[PDB]
Every structure is written in structure tokens, then in C-alpha cells.
Amino acid sequence: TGIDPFTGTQACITAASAVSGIIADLDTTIMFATAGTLNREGAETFADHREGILKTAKVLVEDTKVLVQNAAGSQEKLAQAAQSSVATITRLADVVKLGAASLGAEDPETQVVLINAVKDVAKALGDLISATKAAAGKVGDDPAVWQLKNSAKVMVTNVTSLLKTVKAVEDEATKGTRALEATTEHIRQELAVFCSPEPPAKTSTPEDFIRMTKGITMATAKAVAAGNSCRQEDVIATANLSRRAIADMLRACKEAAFHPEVAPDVRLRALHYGRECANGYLELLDHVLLTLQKPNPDLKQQLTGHSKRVAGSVTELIQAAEAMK
Amino acid sequence: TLDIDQSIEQLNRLILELDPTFEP
């Protein structure tokens, strides 16, 4: 019987047309993204899309193997293999688009890098489907069989390049976030030490304590600036400045408070507002981290309230220092 | 389950499986 024996071949032709459209669709998105109009969906951290990309990417690796294995054999099995791969790349493209958009319109250079990485996969799939067609029901020795295997590696090479780009993107997207977190743990360790019953390394004068307190002023303002700019470089600088400023203020506070010439109520008062200041400040940094994950106007206005809470303790801290003489 | 650190390992080996110039 003349059962249709070019359906596999036919599926390859239809697949090639589909892949052409996806690439054209990714070029369009690169255009929008380059112009800065591919906006973030409020929050929707990159960490979410990363899983969907990776999951779909592993499915695409299986579809690659199925294509290679099924080029020799049934037309129907080849037709099925072609169709499956096109469905997967459609989905992979779409989830990568969402991941790139989740980086936000203020980082357009990285958005385009990400979309191109998946575009490269799309191109490699087109070549792979073309190679299976040329190899459709050919046996091992045939150069088309050689070419099919070679086409499939140039596909998986692209897939791993996509995965490498995703890893590089996410590290850069959180380098400041992860630095600020390191600072909050250091501050907590410092504050646990500050609050511990062990004495400070030495005593000091109100003037040493006072000069550290003023450091809080410059750091709070800086932190507020990083939360408003959301620039990872400002976040890095805030992390470094905040760690030193709070650590220093806690050291001098306890050293000044334990000075023999300080009355027990004034020592008590100084220690209390030292803790208060650090705690208010940790809540400010924690609000900064929330702002970095969903940088809308609402969260940023709330930075004002946190800055006031730190400032309120600073006033107490300065009056406590003066009362040590 | 596998994360990107291990996937990129299995896939670099898979690139060599497919690679028809590479046959030890």
C-alpha cells in the first residue's frame, strides 16, 4: 500500500518553518529589550524562572537524543520526534523571555545577552532538524549520519552555553544582594558579642565613642541611596560601609560604657541605645533587600521611616555619650 | 533532581558522546 512515507520529511519541513518563526520572535524581543521596554513583572525573582529554563532545557536534551536516534527508522517516529522538539523550544524560548524580562528594564545589555543565548539554541535546533531530514532513514556510514551526530553536538553545545549564561547572569544579579546579606550576619555576630556579658577590650573616652556614632549618619544616608538607586555597586558600597560603621559604633559604645568613671545608669543607658541603634539599622537593611526584590515606589518611600528610626536612636546615643562627663 | 552545576557536567560529557570525531 502507498501509505504516506514522507510524513517524517514533511514534519521536518514544517518544523523548519516553526523554528524560523521563533528565531524571528527572539530577534523582535531583542529589539524591544535593547530599547529598554522589556519591563520586569513587579518582583518575580530570576530564581523562579531559572528552574523552568533548566527543566525545559533538560527536556530539550532528550528531544535532541530522540531526533538523532529516530532519523533512521519510521517516518512516523521521525515526524513525532520533530514535532516534540519544536514544542519544547517554543516553551524554552517563552520561559527564557520571562527570565530576561524579570531582570528589569534598567539592565538591557544583560537582557539581550540572555535572549541571544536561547536564540542560539533555536538556530542549532533548525540545523539539527535539517540534518535529520538529510539523514532520514540513512544508515551509519552515510555522511548524513555523521552530519546528524555533528549537528546534535552543535545543539547540546548551545544548550550548555545557555545554561552557562544563566549561571553567570544570576551571580551578577545577586552579587550586591549577597554582599549585603553577609554584612547583616557580621552585624548580628558583632551585636551578639556587644550584648555578651564579657567586657570590652578596653575602656575609652566619650570622644572616641562620639566619633563612631557620627559614622552611622553617613551610612544610613548611603543605604537609603542604594535602596533608591538599586545599583548593585551602591549596594556593595552600602554593605561595606554599613558593616564597618555598625561594628565600630558597637565596639566604642561598650568600651566607653564600661569606663570606671561612668555611672551604672549611664552605662546601662548607653548599652541599651547601642543595641537599639543596631537593631533599627538591621531592619533598615532588611527593607533595602525587600526593595531590591520588588523595586517599586511604595517600598522606597518606606525607607524614610526606617531612617528616622535609626536617627532617633542616634540622638539618644549622642546624649548618652555627653552624659559620660 | 539536578541543578546547573551538575547539568553542565553531564551535558559536556553528552557533547562528547554525540561528537563523532571523538571515539576512544
Side-chain angles (χ1 to χ4, degrees):
Chain A
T1 62
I3 59 102
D4 195 354
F6 95 116
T7 67
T9 313
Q10 188 44 247
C12 293
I13 293 155
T14 66
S17 182
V19 170
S20 176
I22 292 170
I23 291 165
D25 180 284
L26 292 164
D27 287 332
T28 294
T29 310
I30 287 167
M31 212 164 299
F32 278 108
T34 296
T37 66
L38 185 66
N39 51 290
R40 158 176 249 177
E41 300 297 310
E44 291 185 359
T45 75
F46 196 70
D48 294 320
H49 299 94
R50 155 221 174 288
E51 288 294 345
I53 293 162
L54 185 58
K55 179 197 314 307
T56 307
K58 295 170 178 38
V59 171
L60 201 56
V61 182
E62 294 320 304
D63 294 334
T64 295
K65 291 184 175 73
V66 176
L67 273 168
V68 174
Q69 66 178 102
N70 287 15
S74 168
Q75 284 295 292
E76 302 136 29
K77 262 177 153 192
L78 196 43
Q80 190 43 241
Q83 290 172 303
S84 286
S85 72
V86 176
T88 305
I89 193 64
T90 295
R91 185 163 65 261
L92 181 55
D94 288 344
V95 301
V96 172
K97 282 187 295 172
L98 293 178
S102 83
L103 301 171
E106 294 200 352
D107 194 14
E109 286 173 30
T110 304
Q111 287 182 321
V112 174
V113 170
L114 187 57
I115 303 148
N116 267 300
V118 70
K119 184 173 149 171
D120 290 349
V121 175
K123 292 165 151 227
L125 182 58
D127 295 346
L128 179 55
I129 288 165
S130 194
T132 89
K133 188 157 141 305
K138 308 280 90 177
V139 190
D141 259 0
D142 209 8
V145 171
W146 170 251
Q147 284 286 21
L148 174 60
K149 288 187 78 152
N150 203 77
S151 178
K153 100 176 182 197
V154 170
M155 173 73 173
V156 187
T157 294
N158 279 226
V159 176
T160 62
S161 282
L162 170 62
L163 295 181
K164 263 159 200 171
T165 297
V166 169
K167 170 184 172 57
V169 171
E170 193 168 27
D171 287 339
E172 271 292 314
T174 57
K175 62 184 304 170
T177 298
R178 283 174 291 97
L180 199 157
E181 296 175 330
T183 281
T184 60
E185 213 63 30
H186 186 273
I187 290 169
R188 279 174 192 110
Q189 303 153 10
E190 286 306 290
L191 182 158
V193 167
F194 176 85
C195 286
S196 75
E198 290 173 1
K202 219 262 151 187
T203 67
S204 67
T205 185
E207 297 84 12
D208 175 38
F209 171 43
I210 294 162
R211 69 176 52 101
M212 300 293 98
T213 299
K214 186 62 171 66
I216 299 299
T217 302
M218 175 55 194
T220 294
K222 182 73 155 136
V224 170
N228 278 273
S229 78
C230 295
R231 285 179 179 186
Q232 288 291 297
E233 297 83 359
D234 301 349
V235 180
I236 289 175
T238 291
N240 296 335
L241 182 57
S242 298
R243 180 188 45 256
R244 255 11 269 243
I246 289 276
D248 280 358
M249 179 276 281
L250 291 173
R251 169 179 61 70
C253 178
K254 197 178 189 175
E255 286 177 346
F258 269 70
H259 191 289
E261 183 73 356
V262 169
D265 294 325
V266 179
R267 168 160 52 262
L268 185 45
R269 173 182 192 199
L271 296 175
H272 180 277
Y273 284 108
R275 174 164 168 287
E276 176 157 281
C277 182
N279 282 335
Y281 199 86
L282 279 169
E283 295 165 333
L284 164 67
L285 302 183
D286 280 336
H287 193 67
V288 169
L289 291 166
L290 286 165
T291 299
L292 296 174
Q293 285 174 74
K294 195 175 59 215
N296 62 37
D298 216 339
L299 267 60
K300 291 181 200 185
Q301 144 90 36
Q302 293 168 55
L303 286 163
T304 312
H306 281 105
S307 63
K308 246 188 192 163
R309 283 183 177 278
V310 177
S313 60
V314 169
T315 69
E316 286 303 315
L317 279 173
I318 286 166
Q319 291 172 292
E322 298 293 343
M324 289 168 168
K325 51 201 191 175
Chain B
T1 174
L2 308 158
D3 57 7
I4 295 199
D5 289 324
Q6 309 141 357
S7 300
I8 293 193
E9 299 194 49
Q10 302 166 8
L11 261 50
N12 292 342
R13 311 192 323 263
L14 187 90
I15 281 167
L16 286 194
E17 297 183 30
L18 284 169
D19 199 331
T21 46
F22 181 69
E23 266 144 17

